[PDB]
């Protein structure tokens, strides 16, 4: 699956504890091409994710050097 | 449940069939306080819906008429 992300925003940083686990939940809206990651009911990440329909190898050609 | 809608948007109008039925699917992201209604996988309505924490009757008092 070649994927495309857009307008990714990180609202808060989750801190992994030394002992235990943290549960991260992902909810997708296929129609609106929007996603949302949450922890304990608190929004942590949001943006837009959808499949890349027509990949272009041109995109990954290395850009002209700053120097 | 006193509810508050916000930034509601309608993308298309569904034509109720004369014969048969039409099924609408609604999805909520409680963390983002957003909702989407999809018809056959097509976005129809979008916005933000959340519970009204502190209702106040003063809001519904009729504004004085300019005439």
Swiss-Prot record, chains A, B:
In adipocytes, S-nitrosylation of Fatty acid synthase occurs under physiological conditions and gradually increases during adipogenesis. It is found in: Cytoplasm; Melanosome. Ubiquitous. Prominent expression in brain, lung, liver and mammary gland. It comes from the Eukaryota. Homodimer which is arranged in a head to tail fashion. Interacts with CEACAM1; this interaction is insulin and phosphorylation-dependent; reduces fatty-acid synthase activity. The relatively low beta-ketoacyl synthase activity may be attributable to the low 4'-phosphopantetheine content of the protein. Fatty acid synthetase is a multifunctional enzyme that catalyzes the de novo biosynthesis of long-chain saturated fatty acids starting from acetyl-CoA and malonyl-CoA in the presence of NADPH. This multifunctional protein contains 7 catalytic activities and a site for the binding of the prosthetic group 4'-phosphopantetheine of the acyl carrier protein ([ACP]) domain. This is Fatty acid synthase. The lineage of its organism: Eukaryota, Metazoa, Chordata, Craniata, Vertebrata. The gene is FASN.
């Amino acid at each position: 699956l070649p994927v495309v992300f857009e307008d990714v925003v990180l609202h808060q940083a989750t801190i992994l504890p030394k002992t235990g686990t943290v549960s991260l939940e992902v909810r997708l809206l296929e129609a609106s091409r929007a996603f949302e990651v949450s922890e304990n009911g608190n929004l942590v990440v949001s943006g837009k994710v959808y499949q890349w329909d027509d990949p272009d190898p041109r995109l990954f050609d290395h850009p002209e050097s700053p120097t």
